[PDB]
């Protein structure tokens, strides 16, 4: 999409990530796991629900069929002209308001992902390289405590910086 | 290196076959969606506030109020939640002539 | 029939919370707004890509 992450530089989704819309897959010595980014999923959920509510909260109140005699053909045509006139407006509004917001929502999600990936890249700097498909290979040893530190955004950068310097120089 | 542990960033996928239209694209499969459009009915006329409609049947407003003899099922009518004319509603004025401002009367009666 | 509804149209009763219906323009009670569409579905989730 617009931010080239979803169906973009991250080629596919994770059917194995039940807990949220965006998150992390880790691999260390201890094993493999998934984890949702609770905070950004939450921001998204709130954003999207609010969007949905606005489109709907707007719409409100109005049809009460009328009759006319054989000498009232002009006011009858006007009544129909009115009824059809509003019906097309309201139909157009609705259909197009939905086409527009769908486009925007899929881009929103796309942005959220790109932004999540960038938040990590930002923390890790040169302590890990980018190996594509939204993956970060660590120059150092990252246990379960170190992974959690990435996901809650409180990763201690210099802590592992010295161990990571000496690994880029050689292997 | 040496272990080269990996973290990756990704998104939800599921076995949803719900599809939406965007402006740039049609039939996009999405993980979740909301239907905004009701298209089901129960094919019957029902009560409102627990009061049955008035079924004029073969009669029409005119035959009803005037008391066309085909409308005797209507003689005891007193309350209703709305009025139904069927597309068989032919019995109106039996002796022929103009019902003056009839359309206006219909309007008055619809409240 | 002896059913109850909060919204009635000449084709039948509607028993629903949605903002729109395409059943009939004429309604009695509390009804969704009539439109001519056959589809108004709003994305909430993301593009669903279950694999490579």
């Amino acid at each position, epitope marked *: 999409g617009l931010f080239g992450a979803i169906a973009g530089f991250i080629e596919g989704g994770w059917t194995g990530m039940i807990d949220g819309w965006y998150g992390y897959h880790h691999q260390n010595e201890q094993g493999s796991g998934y984890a949702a980014d609770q905070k950004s999923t939450q921001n998204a959920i709130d954003g999207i629900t609010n969007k949905v*509510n606005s489109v709907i909260e707007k719409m409100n109140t109005q049809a009460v069929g009328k009759e006319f005699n054989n000498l009232e053909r002009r006011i009858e045509n006007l009544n129909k002209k009115v009824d059809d006139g509003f019906l097309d407006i309201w139909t157009y509004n609705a259909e197009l308001l939905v086409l527009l917001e769908n486009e925007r929502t899929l881009d929103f999600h796309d942005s959220n992902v790109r932004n999540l990936y960038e938040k990590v890249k930002s923390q890790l700097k040169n302590n890990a390289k980018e190996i594509g498909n939204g993956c970060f290979e660590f120059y150092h040893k990252c246990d379960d405590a170190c992974m959690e530190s990435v996901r809650n955004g409180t990763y201690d950068y210099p802590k592992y910086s010295e161990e990571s310097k000496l690994n880029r120089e050689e292997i | 290196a040496d272990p080269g542990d990996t973290i990756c960033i990704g998104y939800h996928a599921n076995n949803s076959t719900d599809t939406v239209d965007t402006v740039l694209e049609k039939n996009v499969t999405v993980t979740h969606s909301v239907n905004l459009l009701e298209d089901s009915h129960n094919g019957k006329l029902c009560k409102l506030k627990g009061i049955a409609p008035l079924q004029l049947g073969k009669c029409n407003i005119a035959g009803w109020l005037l008391g066309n003899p085909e409308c005797d099922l209507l003689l005891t009518a007193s309350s209703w939640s709305y009025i139904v004319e069927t597309s068989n509603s032919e019995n109106g004025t039996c002796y022929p002539g103009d019902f003056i401002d009839y359309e206006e009367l219909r309007e008055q009666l619809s409240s | 029939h002896d059913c109850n509804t909060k919204c009635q149209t000449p084709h039948g009763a509607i028993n629903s919370s949605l903002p729109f219906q395409n059943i009939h323009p004429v309604t009695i009670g509390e009804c969704p707004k009539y439109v001519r569409s056959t589809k108004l579905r709003m994305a909430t989730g993301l593009r669903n890509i279950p694999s490579i």
Partner: antibody, heavy 122, light 108 residues
Framework: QVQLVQSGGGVVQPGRSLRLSCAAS????????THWVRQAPGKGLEWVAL????????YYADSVKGRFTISRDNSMNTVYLQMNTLRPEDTAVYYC???????????????WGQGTLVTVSS | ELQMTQSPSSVSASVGDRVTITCRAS??????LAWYQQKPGKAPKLLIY???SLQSGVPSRFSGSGSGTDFTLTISSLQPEDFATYYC?????????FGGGTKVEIKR
């Protein structure tokens, strides 16, 4: 924003059954899970049950389980708590609360109903 | 059999006072703990979830902290509208569990 209007409180006899309602004023409700919580007179809050946004699942306390069934009617935008083997210790005011996350259950209750009193006694 | 305990059962305080309530869980529940406020005869309000995240409506007077087994809610400067009962609640596992409540009362 969301008002949850609760319905179906009442006086009932132990053994005999009762059904509770939680109807949301706002369309988006059908995207959230729903909790039921209760409060015995003068007492603390006790979690009772949850149902996800589809009805997919579906969770209960131990205090009650195999006596209460939670269900959901997303088209009518309402949620139901069916209570069968009622017992004097189930007397309480009952609250439904919307979940903070659902589509993703988070187990926290962010919008509450007014609460509905149920009295189990003979 | 998760058991949430709240301490103390009451506190009396002047408006302006810093009140601090604790809540202890019988086993480790990570940081998945929420605080609610309930005035009598009304529904509870959410204040804090995930140990320390403030919920959007809530004045920042409110502040949660803790991890694993021990948790505290702190009201920095009790306002008149803060006299009510406060319940903690674990969101680690089902069934969900409420502490037993801490009433905070005016001190005249």
């Amino acid at each position: 924003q969301v008002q949850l209007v609760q319905s179906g409180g009442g006086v009932v006899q132990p053994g005999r059954s009762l059904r509770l309602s939680c109807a949301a004023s706002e369309f988006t409700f059908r995207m959230y899970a729903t909790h039921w919580v209760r409060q015995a007179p003068g007492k603390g809050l006790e979690w009772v049950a949850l149902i996800s946004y589809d009805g997919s699942n579906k969770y209960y306390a131990d205090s009650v389980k195999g006596r209460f069934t939670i269900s959901r009617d997303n088209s009518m935008n309402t949620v139901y708590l069916q209570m069968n083997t009622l017992r004097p210790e189930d007397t309480a005011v009952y609250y439904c609360a919307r979940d903070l996350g659902g589509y993703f259950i988070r187990g926290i209750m962010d919008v509450w109903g007014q609460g509905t009193l149920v009295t189990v006694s003979s | 059999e998760l058991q949430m305990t709240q301490s103390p059962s009451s506190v009396s305080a002047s408006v302006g006072d810093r009140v601090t309530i604790t809540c202890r869980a019988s086993q480790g529940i990570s940081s998945w703990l929420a605080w609610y406020q309930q005035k009598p005869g009304k529904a509870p309000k959410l204040l804090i979830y995930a140990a320390s995240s403030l919920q959007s409506g809530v004045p920042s007077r409110f502040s949660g902290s803790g991890s694993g087994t021990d948790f505290t809610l702190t009201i920095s400067s009790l306002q008149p509208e803060d006299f009510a009962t406060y319940y903690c609640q674990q969101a680690n596992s089902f069934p969900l569990t409420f502490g037993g409540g801490t009433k905070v009362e005016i001190k005249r």
